[PDB]
Amino acid sequence: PPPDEEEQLLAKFVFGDTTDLQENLAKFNADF
Amino acid sequence: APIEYLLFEEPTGYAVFKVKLQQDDIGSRLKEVQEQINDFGAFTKLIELVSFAPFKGAAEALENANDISEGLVSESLKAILDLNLPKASSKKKNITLAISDKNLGPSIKEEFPYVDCISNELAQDLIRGVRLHGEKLFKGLQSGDLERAQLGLGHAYSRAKVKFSVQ
Amino acid sequence: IKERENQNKFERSTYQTKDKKLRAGLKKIDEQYKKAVSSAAATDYLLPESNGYLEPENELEKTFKVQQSEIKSSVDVSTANKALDLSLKEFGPYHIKYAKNGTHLLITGRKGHVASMDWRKGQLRAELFLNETCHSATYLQNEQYFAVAQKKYTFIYDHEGTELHRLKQHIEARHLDFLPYHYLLVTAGETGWLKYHDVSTGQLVSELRTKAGPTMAMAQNPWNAVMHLGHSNGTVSLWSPSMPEPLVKLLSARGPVNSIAIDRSGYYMATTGADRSMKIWDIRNFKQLHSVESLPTPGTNVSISDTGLLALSRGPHVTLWKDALKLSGDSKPCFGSMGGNPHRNTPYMSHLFAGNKVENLGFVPFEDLLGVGHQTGITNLIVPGAGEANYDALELNPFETKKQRQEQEVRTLLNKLPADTITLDPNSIGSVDKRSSTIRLNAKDLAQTTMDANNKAKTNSDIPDVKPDVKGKNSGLRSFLRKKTQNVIDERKLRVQKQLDKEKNIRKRNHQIKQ
Amino acid sequence: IVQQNRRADHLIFPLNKPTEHNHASAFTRTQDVPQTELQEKVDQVLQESQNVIINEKVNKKNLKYQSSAVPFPFENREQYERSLRMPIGQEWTSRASHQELIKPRIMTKPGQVIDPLKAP
Amino acid sequence: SKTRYYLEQCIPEMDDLVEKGLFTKNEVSLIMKKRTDFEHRLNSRGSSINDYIKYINYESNVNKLRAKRCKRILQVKKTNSLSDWSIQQRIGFIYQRGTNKFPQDLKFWAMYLNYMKARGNQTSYKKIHNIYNQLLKLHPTNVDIWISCAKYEYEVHANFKSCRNIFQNGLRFNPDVPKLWYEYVKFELNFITKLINRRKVMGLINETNPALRGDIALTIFDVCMKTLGKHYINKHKKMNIELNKETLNYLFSESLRYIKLFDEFLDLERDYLINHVLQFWKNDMYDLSLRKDLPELYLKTVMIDITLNIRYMPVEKLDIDQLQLSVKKYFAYISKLDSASVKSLKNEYRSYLQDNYLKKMNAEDDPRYKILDLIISKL
Amino acid sequence: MKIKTIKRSADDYVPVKSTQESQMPRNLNPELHPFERAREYTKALNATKLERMFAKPFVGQLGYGHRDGVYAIAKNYGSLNKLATGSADGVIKYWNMSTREEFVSFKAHYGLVTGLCVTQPRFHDKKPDLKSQNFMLSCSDDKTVKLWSINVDDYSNKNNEEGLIRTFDGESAFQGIDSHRENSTFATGGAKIHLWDVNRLKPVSDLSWGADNITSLKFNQNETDILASTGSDNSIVLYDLRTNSPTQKIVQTMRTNAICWNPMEAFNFVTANEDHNAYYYDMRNLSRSLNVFKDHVSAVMDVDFSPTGDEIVTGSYDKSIRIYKTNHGHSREIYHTKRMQHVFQVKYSMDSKYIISGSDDGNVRLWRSKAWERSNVKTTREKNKLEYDEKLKERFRHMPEIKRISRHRHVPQVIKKAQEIKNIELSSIKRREANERRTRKDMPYISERKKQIVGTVHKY
RNA sequence: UUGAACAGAGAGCAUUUCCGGCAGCAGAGAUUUCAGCUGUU
Hints:
This is part of a larger assembly, with chains A, B, C, D, E and F. Helix content of chain A is about 60%, strand content about 0%. By secondary structure, chain A is mainly alpha-helical. The radius of gyration of chain A is 12 Å and the shape is elongated. By secondary structure, chain B is of the alpha/beta class. Helices cover about 45% and strands about 15% of the residues of chain B. Chain B has a five-stranded mixed sheet with strand order 3-2-1-4-5, sandwiched between helices. In chain B, strand 4, helix 5 (about 105-110) and strand 5 form a beta-alpha-beta unit. In chain B, helix 3 crosses helix 7 (about 145-160). Chain B is globular, with a radius of gyration of 17 Å. By secondary structure, chain F is an alpha+beta fold. In chain F, the strands form seven sheets. Chain F has a five-stranded antiparallel sheet with strand order 15-16-17-18-30, with no helix packed on it. Chains in contact: A-E, B-D, B-E, B-F, C-D, C-E, C-F, D-E, D-F, E-F. Strand 1 of chain C pairs antiparallel with strand 1 (about 1-5) of chain F, so a sheet runs across the interface. Chain E binds one RNA strand through helix 6.
């Protein structure tokens, strides 16, 4: 079974990965 | 007897310490045990702070200072020693308490009959170590500037004994 | 005491009693050993890093086709900057050495340009222009002292570069080494003499005569501090300072032995000879595992990394093999997979220094980097999977400070191992002497042995017993009387002669009765 | 008890269990007598309510680093060399294992009288 | 070192988690890297209480992730293994170490106590008592900790003896704080009210005493007045007469707020308690006459008695005879007092009677309301 | 193609804050840690050399000493720092070892103070104040046993009499004294052994085995109703007070001087002998000794156990003190001094850290039980370092030069020459016994632990 | 020296008592949580 969104949030905090942060850095260009 | 508890009279309140380790007495005149009082890494292995009852104000500080000078036991001292010292037997196995002043011993003995007061040179060494290190052992539980409390209490004590009159 | 997967490397080898105290004590010893081994293996959860890797995704992807530019673009910026190139066209070629921490690099040109630097900081500790032929250099217990093998004598310099010592006893050394636990600087060279010098006291510990001409190669075994020398007759010899003759002689190559490398565990050794042959040997059992014959050109250098990669440099080329040190024949290094055979061990990596010649190789400790010295300076190649990711900060600390270095110096000096402790087997300290009895003899048993030795002369058990079945050609009494001196006549020889005569008479009587 | 103490791995003095009194607590009053006027009044109201050649020569400089014979408590070499199997050091063992191995047998408090043991 | 020892103590939990299907070995390695950072920060120099708070938060979120993973993979709410209590034990140990190192951070002490109360089934009343004992010895002059101790013992265990002993020891250490006296009075009134309602419950199931009267709270009140006055004088020690008047005014406010607590207590005999407090204030204090010293407060007390004669009764069910008796007492007080004092007391009584009855009931609606309006016009 | 390298963030190895200590990554892989045996061996050898540097055993003397030689020493079993000493001029001093000075000195007797013990008297009518006062019994050749009270400053509970309370008078001289560990009774040696009571002015009972004098006494510490005594007829006699009778007698080759019971084992005791040896005995079987302690040169004058029961201490006529483990039959340590003379009393402190010796020169001295140890409280790192050093020394004690350094002591020239003379004499006896065993076909092999015993009264 | 009543401590030992399954009811706390009750296993 797939993880719940709460479970993935807990996994991001506990395992300390920055994949979401790198994704935001790649996504952020000329927004304003 | 081994010392189980220690009583220190601060200007700012009363402090009760637990004696975790006994310093050896047969070799208590030796260089090692006389330097372990000065060293803070070794004295911490000996003693640990259990309780601290601060005074309410300068007037109560002066009253307690007069009581300690006379050798009497105040309600504050009764309260802190009732809260900290375990209830033991008068006939056998009393609780040992280290005191700086020998004359304070009979008063505490009358208030709590289950307490044996020790004021020999070993207890004097422990109390000297507590006085020497001071604010480090209190773990930040001190709420006021202890040196200025000392300075003001000494002035108040001297004025009170001389009966200084501003008129 | 649960069993664990990684327990094997933490296991230690060892070379029914009626006593109850001894039984309980041995049971406690075994219990403590098992508990300590399991609790040591349980600490692999606390390892902070992981080793590098280089994995091909497709069938068309070959690891030896991967270029240093592609690796430098792929990996992170710090490691890309760690891969440094120094162009030094004048005083080449350069022999390179790294500190055991790997924080300092010591280069030495053939024309006297010797430099010590903090290569990662970019800070130059020392720089010397000796205007003289220089062959090798090594660091001592720190980066604070280094030894240079110059034209005739070996010199020792401090951190800033002032000459401290000129070792008159070390003459024409081409190879330098340091044993970091024994504080021994080992020099070999053109004279065919191996010299161990104590750098702490200044006393020359050993002068050993190799008797095999100039030493072509030299490596140390980091496991037991035994020096493996390579001579021009094709033999690697194993040397200990306490013995005047070599411990082991291995016939490795036909021609001169070009290079020797020994892995960190001290269990495998690789040699290259002038016969274009690279051989991988087991050290502890002294058999050879692999013998790659007919390389395209003779391999000038071999190096072995902490993870177990094997680097071979032959002129301009540097090729690395992964898992080449194992026992199986699938682990034999080769150059081409004949139609993609997976049992053939094609090279893990390769690089070409075009128009150049590699001088020496050295893997950077605890880094995924191989330093190459060559005719125009030094390069670092990025090799994922080369250095040990998890170090121990008590032994070697790459992030060491000045006060930590100062404390570690005195600590290692206090725990310096005496040179007589160097043996083939490091677990010989603490053992019972081999000539000594296997079982303990008390007073009663020793008195019984003395009584038996006294009664042996009366019982005539010293002389061999008469055997009529055994022929007189091979009879023990005949050999005893032959080995004894002819002129000297003793009581024991008289009894041996009488017993031999009696046995000969009995054999003659039996032969006559049969005939 | 003496055989138990002999085959015990660790002895921590005082082996006699000291008498223990009621801990001083805020949840109860220890004196069992009212010590404050408030307590007096409340209590009152409540009361009223070859390829390989190996050197076989004896390394004479090495023999100072070997035992001369098998020592006393062990009866043979296999047992004696099993006694040296695992290092005690922190470099080769876990922290807890190192502490367990360096822990002594007889352990005493630094400044107290050690008594003859009592009968159970 | 200590960091290494604590990590090796963390090892068997990860053995258990790897043994179950919950966590991958690499995931265990990442968790242990974070724990290595946190344990190094705790056992090194330069640490703060914020490091303890961050480590507790991390272990809490690790426990939440473990719970989700155990629900998802094994389909069981909890395994019967080490791992379900080991994170909780670790969090308690971090709290214990933090309170031992920095005992002065009352927020961290509150966090420790809240956590240990929250994990109710696994914890022990002995553990909560020990944390209270340590905290009360370290901070004996913090009234709120005594109040919280007594509150925990009263709602959770319903231990009235322990609550009484806690309040008595706390007042021994803090005799000058009015708040602890107030909470002691509130606890004792709650206890006697629960006893009264328990007797009533028994009397309805089936088929006097000064304790039920409230004399315990009255004695606590009297000892409160003496002790608070003495300590207020000691803190702030013709001018002495002014200080004594200020002390009497200060004690009057606490007395009026005790009156408000008594009015909040509907089930108890409010008339009895107000009679006792006005008897005490009729008795002279601080060597000065109360009415002569504070005529404004004396008029306030007289108006309070006159109003509270009928204020306990509802306006809808108000007694005309009781209202007339209150008006007669007000007229007697106005005759006794000065003319300006009589006018002020009459205005206050008229305003109180208006806000009681005139807004509630109309003169056309109630025939007695017309008489009340006439009496208000007379006043 | 997946390219992954070693990346090391600086945050995990170099701390951001200046105040924080650096992290220590550790890898227990043995390849990172070579030379286990040699490295631990060098650590252990350095530990033995450090022990030899730190061996400074003499703590100091007590006061100015007696005017005459010290012949009776008795420790207080309740108090750590108190001692009682008595000399040959009749003078008895009570000592505080913490300040190294005497509470009081008494001109007690006119003869030699033959026996001294520290008591807790239990009277029918009254209870003595044992917190404020300590009590000691003495016995001399002037036919008297006396009881003394000493004022003590350990507690400050209050704001009496020091001196003679009661004099017990006997018919003949007394030679030793000991008191019961839980009763009021005590026993004195001399011509006859007498069990006394502090409430009675004359002996309660006579326990003597026959018409022989008795030199020294010792009450068992655990089974407090057992007594042991030494006689001048080379005899050790046990006594039981429940049966009120002399239990058993053993006769040895020479006269035993002193007896000490194991604090931890109710049925073991050590006797000092004129053999130049001490013997460890099991009470249940006196046909053989448990251990023989053999290192002294002249007659062993006194023996005391450690409170832990692991070690004994012997003080002898060869002017030396020797410490023994109960396991081994030879000494662990020797103490001597040019100023020290014949040692007649050694006691072992209740801390088990110090040794107190009284000598013929009149001085009482304090020594460390372990010379290299120090009396400070240790930090965690220092305590672990010392424990690791001790375990490593124990592991590698069997090695040649570790043994060579560890066994080395500076010994007086008289003791050394007497040792080599005794070695030559023992070798001569060994060759004579070898010749006798050669001559006789069947000779019995008698045990070293059997040789000293002439006989026992009750056979086994 | 023993017995009895009282007040305790958390500080030891034992448990072949019950609870850390489920369903349902109901209450309280900050939509969820909490212990409790009634059944069942």
